[PDB]
RNA sequence: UGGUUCUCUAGGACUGAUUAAUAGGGACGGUCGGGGGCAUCAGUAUUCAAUUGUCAGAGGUGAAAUUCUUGGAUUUAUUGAAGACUAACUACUGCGAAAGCAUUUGCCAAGGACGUUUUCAUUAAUCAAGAACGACCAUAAACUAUGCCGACUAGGGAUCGGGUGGUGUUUUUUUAAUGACCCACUCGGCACCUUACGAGAACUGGGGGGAGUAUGGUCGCAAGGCUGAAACUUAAAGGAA
């Protein structure tokens, strides 16, 4: 599997059982701004990233607010003119969780990317 | 498959009670190297006698890259050498007495293990090509 | 010699092991004997798990010094010391100490 | 008595005839007692419940497909959407 | 521990001692000064052997009797595979237990399929019929054969007459199956296909072949 | 550092980038197992034979029978030979990729888990294709069964292999090392008993439910009536009553 695809499978299904806190192993620069995004829209509260020499591991802490997250495996270029479409297709309903793509100005969701007018690669969802 | 490894610790510092010398320790290798023992044999006893956690950390680099740099290179990878050798003492064993399937079957395995790291190491071209295993 | 087959079927239970051993031996006359040995393995006083087995290294090695002293107490005799000996069943006890250690 | 029956079997060596998973053991006690046109063979609310399927929630998506590597978009659909 | 005293009981009516030893674990029976039966020691000595394989007390007093004895079947030396040997095993305790009661009703005896043996108590007669029941459904005859068998001797021995006639046109045992051959023209069957010891090599990889 | 004799006390030959995955491989260590191969050893049955002892039956069956038997069967005792097999111990235990594997001892290679502040440094995962394992003496396999699946959370008791710690009893001592049990922790297994939470969608040949009912259709099979005995009112004999 992925490595950003099986810490948000950890971070799916830990919080469908109903934890308080994840451990996901291990962690990259995609995973920060991943978690980033989602902790700016306020899907999750802190998280802690201890470095061990290794690769590092990630604590998140979240309450109860998400309900989906996903990586969109093929990285697809999405314009600026159609990242309403892709929300569109790939949301749950109209003004609904955020797609998150990987641009030119980095990570970021896509009611940012289209705000500072800038496309990308799509990334994920989150919801 | 089993979790069983080494923990390297966090730190990659001489442990503060090392008051050996970061020379004598290459001296030591070199000269065990040349009485002839594998790598990992030269780890081994450095680590349980004279007391180096690891060279990595306490030399400069790895001690392969000593061996190397001062000119004891080994003709093949320790892993393809070890390899190499378990697979020809099993094909003695099977030209001794031929009514051993599991010992067949195990040959079918180490043959394929030898060529999935003879690939590896043909690709980074560590040993050249055109090698064959006999 | 021989027992009778009720006290070995007596003595057979399960959850332990019978480490049995034989050897031929020659005495101090020119008879050649096949003497062989039973024993099984006890649990200790204070032992709470049912099983009480031997680990098999542990029945090699019993086995093992079973039959070096049994041939030591053989060979070091003759048919009737060996008789006088095995009448009051101190072979036994050499096994018993010696294996304790076990 | 179910409970101490087979266990006292399982203990010995005694080889049980197999029951399913929700009824009651038929021993010899059921057929003395007449038992079972009190108690049922089974308790038939737990096997009412376990026979109910698994609720699956409400189904969100369309455009791919949803494995643990995560979603997959198909090219077809990729260059419908663009 | 419980049943003791009625073992007590049970045997001082035959003039046997009986001590039942708690902490290494086993169960003695003695003749005693006033035993004048010199056989009853053999079955005291069965019914301890079966309060130890575990059938119960009111089971087990009846080998005290002149009538009845002890068999102990062994079944673990029969088949190979671990499967095979549980689906007979299985198929000797029945469905529901159905087929091991019909036994027991049919042969008069108490049967304890355990372990890879069956014990039995009974009279000799059901002891012979249970025991060549058990053996052949260990081979791999089917026990409803000898339960429909068993019943038709039953109702084919309560009549007066056809009691020195073989019934063995009455009895469906004898199936005549075993009616196949082969009859290949023997192609590789003759010598086909000799074992070396040494394997082939592998089919190497794209990247292999490359460099 | 010594070949000896005079009381430790007497000379002697002497070049120029990173980690180090609770990914993967390899080494090492003490081990572990009914994993395999070869050799060896044993066991008691069985069958056969030799030798006694004794005499009329022995098998076998629901009863019988084929069979053996005064040229001594069966039973008993001593001994030999053969081919198998490894009883109880034997387990919801172990090992093996699966089929499978149970006597001892040795050799040959192998394997796994654990321990590791050893080594290499991405060498990796899945499977269509393909490969390995699976003229004589003639044989059985299935046959009542079960269960909700995975990318998935925690546990609980018991058990097998390794490791660490504790500090009591069995052990014991200046010959080597080495146990057994109890307890806690931990890793990895074969199972078992539970829990919480998820779309879990996108050796080949097949008609259409279960239980029945009717039939002016089509294809069949089937009745009569004493036989002999019909062209013959016909014998003997048989049947029936």
């Not at chain 5, 469905?95 to 027991?104: F, I, M, R, Y």
Request: charged share 30%; net charge positive; glycine share 6%.
């Amino acid at each position: 599997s992925s490595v950003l695809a099986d810490a948000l499978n950890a971070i799916n299904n830990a919080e469908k059982t109903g934890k308080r806190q994840v451990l996901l192993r291990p962690s990259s620069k995609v995973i920060i701004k991943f978690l980033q995004v989602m902790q700016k829209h306020g899907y999750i509260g802190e998280f802690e990233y201890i470095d061990d020499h290794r690769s590092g591991k990630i604590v998140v802490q979240l309450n109860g607010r998400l309900n989906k997250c996903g990586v969109i495996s093929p990285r697809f270029n999405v314009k600026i003119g159609d990242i309403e479409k892709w929300t569109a297709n790939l949301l749950p309903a109209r003004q609904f969780g955020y797609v998150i793509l990987t641009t030119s100005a980095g990570i970021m969701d896509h009611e940012e990317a289209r705000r500072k007018h800038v496309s990308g690669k799509i990334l994920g969802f989150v919801y | 498959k089993g979790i069983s490894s080494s923990a390297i610790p966090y730190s990659r510092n001489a442990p503060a009670w090392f008051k050996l010398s970061s020379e004598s320790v290459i001296e030591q290798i070199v000269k065990y190297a040349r009485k002839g023992l594998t790598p990992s044999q030269i780890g081994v006893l450095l680590r349980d006698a004279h007391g180096v956690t690891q060279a990595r950390v306490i030399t400069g680099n790895k001690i392969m890259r000593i061996l190397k740099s001062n000119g004891l290179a080994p003709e093949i990878p320790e892993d393809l050498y070890y390899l190499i050798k378990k697979a020809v003492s099993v094909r003695k064993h099977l030209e001794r007495n031929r009514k051993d399937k599991d010992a067949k079957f195990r040959l079918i395995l180490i043959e394929s293990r030898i060529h999935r790291l003879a690939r590896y190491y043909r690709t980074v071209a560590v040993l050249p090509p055109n090698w064959k295993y006999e | 010699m021989d027992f009778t087959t009720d006290k070995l079927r007596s003595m057979v239970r399960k959850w332990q092991t019978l480490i049995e051993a034989n050897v031929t031996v020659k005495t101090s006359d020119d008879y050649v004997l096949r003497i062989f040995a039973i024993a099984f393995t006890r649990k200790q006083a204070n032992q709470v798990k049912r099983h009480s087995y031997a680990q098999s290294s542990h029945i090699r090695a019993i086995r093992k010094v079973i039959s070096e002293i049994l041939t030591k107490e053989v060979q070091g005799s003759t048919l009737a010391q060996l008789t006088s000996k095995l009448i009051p069943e101190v072979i036994n006890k050499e096994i018993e100490n010696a294996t304790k250690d076990i | 008595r179910i409970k101490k029956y087979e266990q006292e079997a399982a203990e010995g060596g005694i080889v049980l005839s197999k029951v399913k998973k929700g009824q009651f053991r038929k021993i010899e006690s059921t057929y003395k007692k007449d038992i079972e046109r009190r108690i049922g063979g089974s308790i038939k609310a737990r096997d009412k419940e376990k026979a109910t399927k698994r609720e699956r929630g409400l189904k969100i998506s369309s455009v791919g497909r949803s494995t643990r590597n995560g979603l997959i978009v198909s090219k077809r659909d990729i260059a419908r959407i663009s | 521990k419980t049943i003791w005293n009625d073992v007590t009981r049970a045997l001082d009516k035959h003039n046997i001692a009986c001590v039942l030893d708690l902490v290494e674990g086993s169960m003695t029976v003695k003749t005693t000064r006033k035993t004048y039966d010199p056989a009853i020691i053999l079955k005291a000595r069965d019914l301890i052997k079966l309060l130890a394989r575990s059938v119960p007390f009111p089971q087990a007093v009846k080998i005290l009797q002149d009538d009845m004895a002890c068999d102990v079947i062994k079944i673990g030396n029969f088949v190979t595979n671990k499967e095979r040997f549980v689906k007979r095993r299985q198929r000797l305790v029945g469905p529901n237990g159905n087929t091991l009661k019909a036994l027991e009703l049919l042969t008069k005896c108490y049967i304890l399929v355990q372990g890879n043996t069956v014990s039995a108590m009974g009279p000799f007669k059901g002891l012979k019929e249970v025991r060549r029941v058990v053996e052949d459904c260990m081979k791999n005859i089917h026990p409803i054969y000898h339960i429909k068998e068993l019943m038709i001797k039953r109702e084919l021995a309560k009549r007066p007459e056809l009691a020195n006639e073989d019934w063995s046109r009455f009895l469906p045992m004898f199936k005549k199956r075993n009616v196949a051959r082969k009859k290949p023209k023997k192609i590789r069957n003759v010598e086909k296909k000799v074992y070396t010891p040494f394997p082939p090599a592998q089919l190497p990889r794209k990247v292999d072949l490359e460099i």
